Protein backbone atom coordinates (compact mmCIF):
# COMPACT_ATOMS: atom_id res chain seq x y z
CA UNK A 1 0.00 0.00 0.00
CA UNK A 2 3.07 2.21 0.39
CA UNK A 3 5.20 2.47 -2.75
CA UNK A 4 8.52 4.28 -3.21
CA UNK A 5 8.78 4.42 -7.00
CA UNK A 6 9.92 8.04 -7.34
CA UNK A 7 12.99 7.47 -5.18
CA UNK A 8 13.76 4.42 -7.33
CA UNK A 9 13.64 6.23 -10.67
CA UNK A 10 17.05 6.29 -12.37
CA UNK A 11 17.15 10.09 -12.51
CA UNK A 12 16.95 10.30 -8.69
CA UNK A 13 19.55 7.61 -7.96
CA UNK A 14 22.22 10.08 -6.86
CA UNK A 15 19.70 12.04 -4.80
CA UNK A 16 19.68 9.34 -2.10
CA UNK A 17 22.49 8.88 0.39
CA UNK A 18 21.54 5.20 0.77
CA UNK A 19 20.00 3.48 -2.26
CA UNK A 20 17.85 1.37 0.07
CA UNK A 21 16.32 4.18 2.15
CA UNK A 22 13.65 5.96 0.12
CA UNK A 23 10.50 8.04 0.82
CA UNK A 24 6.95 6.74 0.39
CA UNK A 25 5.29 8.36 -2.62
CA UNK A 26 2.12 9.33 -0.76
CA UNK A 27 4.01 11.31 1.88
CA UNK A 28 7.16 12.40 0.01
CA UNK A 29 7.79 16.11 -0.24
CA UNK A 30 7.30 16.95 -3.89
CA UNK A 31 9.34 19.97 -4.98
CA UNK A 32 7.73 22.32 -7.47
CA UNK A 33 9.29 25.09 -9.54
CA UNK A 34 12.66 23.49 -10.24
CA UNK A 35 15.22 23.98 -13.01
CA UNK A 36 13.36 23.14 -16.25
CA UNK A 37 16.68 21.87 -17.65
CA UNK A 38 16.76 18.99 -15.15
CA UNK A 39 15.12 15.69 -16.20
CA UNK A 40 13.57 15.49 -12.75
CA UNK A 41 13.60 18.23 -10.13
CA UNK A 42 10.55 17.45 -7.99
CA UNK A 43 12.36 14.93 -5.82
CA UNK A 44 14.07 15.04 -2.47
CA UNK A 45 14.48 12.21 -0.02
CA UNK A 46 12.05 13.74 2.47
CA UNK A 47 8.63 12.85 3.92
CA UNK A 48 5.96 14.91 5.64
CA UNK A 49 5.18 13.54 9.10
CA UNK A 50 1.92 14.41 10.83
CA UNK A 51 0.90 13.16 14.32
CA UNK A 52 -1.64 21.40 13.30
CA UNK A 53 2.05 20.68 13.97
CA UNK A 54 3.90 18.59 11.40
CA UNK A 55 7.47 17.62 10.51
CA UNK A 56 9.66 16.93 7.52
CA UNK A 57 11.92 13.94 8.08
CA UNK A 58 14.82 14.08 5.63
CA UNK A 59 18.40 12.95 5.08
CA UNK A 60 21.42 15.15 5.51
CA UNK A 61 22.23 17.07 2.35
CA UNK A 62 24.43 15.56 -0.34
CA UNK A 63 26.61 17.96 -2.33
CA UNK A 64 24.14 17.64 -5.20
CA UNK A 65 20.96 18.07 -3.12
CA UNK A 66 21.79 21.18 -1.11
CA UNK A 67 19.86 23.33 -3.56
CA UNK A 68 16.90 20.95 -3.37
CA UNK A 69 17.05 21.14 0.42
CA UNK A 70 16.61 24.91 0.38
CA UNK A 71 13.88 24.68 -2.25
CA UNK A 72 12.04 22.37 0.14
CA UNK A 73 12.59 24.56 3.20
CA UNK A 74 11.30 27.53 1.21
CA UNK A 75 8.37 25.69 -0.37
CA UNK A 76 7.06 24.18 2.87
CA UNK A 77 7.56 27.51 4.65
CA UNK A 78 9.63 25.77 7.34
CA UNK A 79 11.16 28.21 9.81
CA UNK A 80 12.85 25.68 12.06
CA UNK A 81 15.45 23.06 11.18
CA UNK A 82 16.60 20.39 13.58
CA UNK A 83 19.97 18.96 12.56
CA UNK A 84 20.65 15.98 14.81
CA UNK A 85 24.15 15.00 13.67
CA UNK A 86 27.57 16.56 13.12
CA UNK A 87 28.51 17.01 9.47
CA UNK A 88 30.89 14.09 9.90
CA UNK A 89 30.66 11.37 12.55
CA UNK A 90 33.23 8.61 12.95
CA UNK A 91 34.80 9.64 9.64
CA UNK A 92 31.53 9.28 7.75
CA UNK A 93 29.77 12.21 6.07
CA UNK A 94 26.22 12.58 7.41
CA UNK A 95 25.39 15.93 5.88
CA UNK A 96 27.21 18.34 3.61
CA UNK A 97 27.33 21.86 5.09
CA UNK A 98 24.22 23.56 3.64
CA UNK A 99 24.52 26.87 5.49
CA UNK A 100 27.03 29.72 5.05
CA UNK A 101 29.78 30.63 7.53
CA UNK A 102 28.75 33.07 10.26
CA UNK A 103 28.04 36.53 8.83
CA UNK A 104 28.47 35.13 5.32
CA UNK A 105 25.90 34.71 2.56
CA UNK A 106 25.73 32.08 -0.14
CA UNK A 107 23.37 31.44 -3.03
CA UNK A 108 22.10 27.88 -3.42
CA UNK A 109 20.58 27.75 -6.85
CA UNK A 110 17.94 30.46 -6.79
CA UNK A 111 17.89 30.50 -2.99
CA UNK A 112 19.85 33.12 -1.05
CA UNK A 113 20.88 32.27 2.52
CA UNK A 114 22.49 34.69 4.94
CA UNK A 115 23.89 33.44 8.25
CA UNK A 116 23.02 36.39 10.48
CA UNK A 117 24.06 34.96 13.82
CA UNK A 118 25.35 31.80 15.46
CA UNK A 119 24.84 31.23 19.18
CA UNK A 120 26.01 28.44 21.45
CA UNK A 121 23.77 26.76 23.98
CA UNK A 122 24.41 23.68 26.10
CA UNK A 123 23.93 20.71 23.77
CA UNK A 124 23.48 22.78 20.65
CA UNK A 125 24.33 25.57 18.27
CA UNK A 126 21.60 27.84 16.98
CA UNK A 127 22.08 29.47 13.60
CA UNK A 128 19.71 32.26 12.68
CA UNK A 129 19.50 32.14 8.90
CA UNK A 130 17.79 34.42 6.42
CA UNK A 131 16.32 32.61 3.44
CA UNK A 132 14.95 34.36 0.37
CA UNK A 133 14.36 33.73 -3.32
CA UNK A 134 16.74 35.61 -5.62
CA UNK A 135 14.13 36.21 -8.31
CA UNK A 136 11.52 37.73 -6.02
CA UNK A 137 11.39 40.57 -3.49
CA UNK A 138 9.04 39.73 -0.61
CA UNK A 139 10.06 36.16 0.17
CA UNK A 140 12.66 36.55 2.92
CA UNK A 141 12.08 34.71 6.20
CA UNK A 142 14.21 33.68 9.13
CA UNK A 143 15.00 30.00 9.41
CA UNK A 144 16.28 28.90 12.79
CA UNK A 145 18.69 26.02 12.54
CA UNK A 146 19.07 24.08 15.78
CA UNK A 147 22.19 21.99 15.51
CA UNK A 148 22.25 19.33 18.19
CA UNK A 149 25.96 18.49 18.40
CA UNK A 150 26.31 16.36 21.54
CA UNK A 151 24.69 13.14 20.33
CA UNK A 152 27.29 10.44 21.11
CA UNK A 153 29.39 8.83 18.38
CA UNK A 154 28.02 5.48 19.59
CA UNK A 155 24.53 4.66 20.82
CA UNK A 156 22.21 7.29 22.25
CA UNK A 157 22.45 9.84 25.07
CA UNK A 158 22.35 8.16 28.49
CA UNK A 159 20.17 10.96 29.89
CA UNK A 160 17.30 12.48 27.86
CA UNK A 161 17.59 15.87 29.56
CA UNK A 162 19.60 17.53 26.78
CA UNK A 163 17.25 16.46 24.00
CA UNK A 164 14.18 17.45 26.03
CA UNK A 165 15.53 20.92 26.84
CA UNK A 166 16.58 21.18 23.20
CA UNK A 167 13.11 20.16 22.03
CA UNK A 168 11.52 22.57 24.52
CA UNK A 169 13.45 25.43 22.93
CA UNK A 170 12.56 24.22 19.45
CA UNK A 171 8.94 23.98 20.57
CA UNK A 172 8.92 27.55 21.91
CA UNK A 173 10.62 28.86 18.74
CA UNK A 174 8.16 27.13 16.41
CA UNK A 175 5.17 28.56 18.34
CA UNK A 176 6.66 32.07 18.40
CA UNK A 177 6.47 32.24 14.62
CA UNK A 178 3.08 32.84 13.04
CA UNK A 179 1.96 29.84 11.01
CA UNK A 180 5.46 28.43 10.57
CA UNK A 181 5.55 25.39 8.31
CA UNK A 182 6.66 21.84 9.25
CA UNK A 183 9.74 21.57 11.45
CA UNK A 184 12.48 20.01 9.29
CA UNK A 185 14.39 17.27 11.10
CA UNK A 186 17.34 15.42 9.62
CA UNK A 187 20.11 12.96 10.28
CA UNK A 188 22.24 10.76 8.04
CA UNK A 189 19.41 8.78 6.45
CA UNK A 190 16.56 10.68 8.06
CA UNK A 191 14.94 7.76 9.89
CA UNK A 192 16.87 6.66 12.98
CA UNK A 193 17.87 9.72 14.98
CA UNK A 194 15.32 11.76 13.04
CA UNK A 195 12.57 9.33 13.95
CA UNK A 196 13.63 9.44 17.60
CA UNK A 197 13.41 13.23 17.91
CA UNK A 198 10.06 13.38 16.12
CA UNK A 199 8.42 10.56 18.07
CA UNK A 200 9.58 12.19 21.31
CA UNK A 201 8.34 15.60 20.20
CA UNK A 202 4.96 14.10 19.28
CA UNK A 203 4.54 12.36 22.65
CA UNK A 204 5.60 15.43 24.65
CA UNK A 205 3.04 17.55 22.80
CA UNK A 206 0.27 15.10 23.70
CA UNK A 207 1.31 15.38 27.34
CA UNK A 208 1.20 19.17 27.07
CA UNK A 209 -2.47 19.01 26.05
CA UNK A 210 -3.73 16.06 28.06
CA UNK A 211 -1.69 16.12 31.27
CA UNK A 212 0.86 13.80 32.88
CA UNK A 213 -1.80 11.09 33.19
CA UNK A 214 -2.97 10.81 29.60
CA UNK A 215 -2.48 7.49 27.84
CA UNK A 216 0.87 7.12 26.09
CA UNK A 217 1.36 4.40 23.47
CA UNK A 218 4.92 4.59 22.11
CA UNK A 219 4.74 1.50 19.85
CA UNK A 220 1.51 2.87 18.38
CA UNK A 221 3.02 6.29 17.71
CA UNK A 222 6.12 4.75 16.14
CA UNK A 223 4.06 2.58 13.81
CA UNK A 224 2.10 5.72 12.96
CA UNK A 225 5.19 7.71 11.90
CA UNK A 226 6.47 4.62 10.10
CA UNK A 227 3.44 4.60 7.83
CA UNK A 228 4.76 7.94 6.54
CA UNK A 229 8.50 7.17 6.29
CA UNK A 230 9.77 3.62 6.68
CA UNK A 231 12.24 2.64 9.38
CA UNK A 232 11.65 5.67 11.66
CA UNK A 233 13.49 4.73 14.90
CA UNK A 234 16.12 2.16 13.90
CA UNK A 235 17.59 0.80 17.11
CA UNK A 236 16.59 -0.72 20.44
CA UNK A 237 18.53 2.04 22.20
CA UNK A 238 16.60 4.74 20.32
CA UNK A 239 13.36 2.96 21.10
CA UNK A 240 14.24 2.97 24.79
CA UNK A 241 15.52 6.54 24.69
CA UNK A 242 12.03 7.59 23.66
CA UNK A 243 10.45 5.84 26.65
CA UNK A 244 12.97 7.47 28.98
CA UNK A 245 12.40 10.90 27.44
CA UNK A 246 8.63 10.82 27.91
CA UNK A 247 8.88 9.71 31.52
CA UNK A 248 11.63 12.23 32.26
CA UNK A 249 9.36 14.90 30.84
CA UNK A 250 6.38 13.71 32.89
CA UNK A 251 8.51 13.64 36.01
CA UNK A 252 9.72 17.17 35.28
CA UNK A 253 6.16 18.48 35.00
CA UNK A 254 5.23 16.80 38.28
CA UNK A 255 7.47 19.59 39.63
C1 LIG B 1 22.51 5.24 8.89
N1 LIG B 1 23.02 5.02 10.28
C2 LIG B 1 23.99 4.08 10.64
C3 LIG B 1 24.62 3.21 9.80
C4 LIG B 1 24.12 1.89 9.62
C5 LIG B 1 24.78 0.99 8.74
C6 LIG B 1 25.94 1.41 8.03
C7 LIG B 1 26.44 2.73 8.21
C8 LIG B 1 25.79 3.63 9.09
C9 LIG B 1 24.18 4.19 12.03
C10 LIG B 1 25.03 3.46 12.80
C11 LIG B 1 24.62 2.37 13.59
N2 LIG B 1 25.67 1.85 14.23
C12 LIG B 1 25.71 0.70 15.15
C13 LIG B 1 25.16 -0.54 14.44
C14 LIG B 1 26.26 -1.55 14.20
O1 LIG B 1 26.56 -2.32 15.07
N3 LIG B 1 26.92 -1.61 12.97
C15 LIG B 1 27.77 -0.63 12.55
C16 LIG B 1 27.41 0.18 11.44
C17 LIG B 1 28.29 1.21 10.99
C18 LIG B 1 29.53 1.44 11.66
C19 LIG B 1 30.35 2.42 11.23
C20 LIG B 1 30.41 3.66 11.94
C21 LIG B 1 31.28 4.69 11.50
C22 LIG B 1 32.08 4.50 10.34
C23 LIG B 1 32.03 3.27 9.63
C24 LIG B 1 31.16 2.23 10.07
C25 LIG B 1 29.89 0.62 12.77
C26 LIG B 1 29.02 -0.41 13.22
N4 LIG B 1 26.67 2.64 13.79
N5 LIG B 1 26.35 3.64 12.92
C27 LIG B 1 23.32 5.22 12.51
C28 LIG B 1 23.07 5.79 13.81
C29 LIG B 1 22.11 6.83 13.97
C30 LIG B 1 21.90 7.36 15.22
O2 LIG B 1 20.82 7.34 15.74
O3 LIG B 1 22.92 7.92 15.87
C31 LIG B 1 21.39 7.31 12.81
O4 LIG B 1 20.46 8.30 12.92
C32 LIG B 1 21.63 6.76 11.51
C33 LIG B 1 22.60 5.72 11.39
From Swiss-Prot:
<comment type="similarity">
    <text>Belongs to the protein-tyrosine phosphatase family. Non-receptor class 2 subfamily.</text>
</comment>
<protein>
    <recommendedName>
        <fullName>Tyrosine-protein phosphatase non-receptor type 11</fullName>
    </recommendedName>
</protein>
<feature type="active site" description="Phosphocysteine intermediate">
    <location>
        <position position="187"/>
    </location>
</feature>
<feature type="binding site">
    <location>
        <position position="153"/>
    </location>
    <ligand>
        <name>substrate</name>
    </ligand>
</feature>
<feature type="binding site">
    <location>
        <begin position="187"/>
        <end position="193"/>
    </location>
    <ligand>
        <name>substrate</name>
    </ligand>
</feature>
<feature type="binding site">
    <location>
        <position position="234"/>
    </location>
    <ligand>
        <name>substrate</name>
    </ligand>
</feature>
<comment type="subunit">
    <text>Interacts with phosphorylated LIME1 and BCAR3. Interacts with SHB and INPP5D/SHIP1. Interacts with MILR1 (tyrosine-phosphorylated). Interacts with FLT1 (tyrosine-phosphorylated), FLT3 (tyrosine-phosphorylated), FLT4 (tyrosine-phosphorylated), KIT and GRB2. Interacts with PDGFRA (tyrosine phosphorylated). Interacts (via SH2 domain) with TEK/TIE2 (tyrosine phosphorylated). Interacts with PTPNS1 and CD84. Interacts with phosphorylated SIT1 and MPZL1. Interacts with FCRL4, FCRL6 and ANKHD1. Interacts with KIR2DL1; the interaction is enhanced by ARRB2. Interacts with GAB2.</text>
</comment>
<feature type="domain" description="Tyrosine-protein phosphatase">
    <location>
        <begin position="1"/>
        <end position="245"/>
    </location>
</feature>
<comment type="function">
    <text>Acts downstream of various receptor and cytoplasmic protein tyrosine kinases to participate in the signal transduction from the cell surface to the nucleus. Positively regulates MAPK signal transduction pathway. Dephosphorylates GAB1, ARHGAP35 and EGFR. Dephosphorylates ROCK2 at 'Tyr-722' resulting in stimulation of its RhoA binding activity. Dephosphorylates CDC73. Dephosphorylates SOX9 on tyrosine residues, leading to inactivate SOX9 and promote ossification. Dephosphorylates tyrosine-phosphorylated NEDD9/CAS-L.</text>
</comment>
Amino acid sequence: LYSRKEGQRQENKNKNRYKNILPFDHTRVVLHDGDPNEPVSDYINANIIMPKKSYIATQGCLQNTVNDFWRMVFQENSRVIVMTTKEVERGKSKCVKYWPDEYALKEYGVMRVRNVKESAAHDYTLRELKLSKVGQGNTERTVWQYHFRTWPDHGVPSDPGGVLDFLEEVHHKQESIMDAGPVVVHCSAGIGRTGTFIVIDILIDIIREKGVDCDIDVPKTIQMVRSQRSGMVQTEAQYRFIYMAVQHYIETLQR
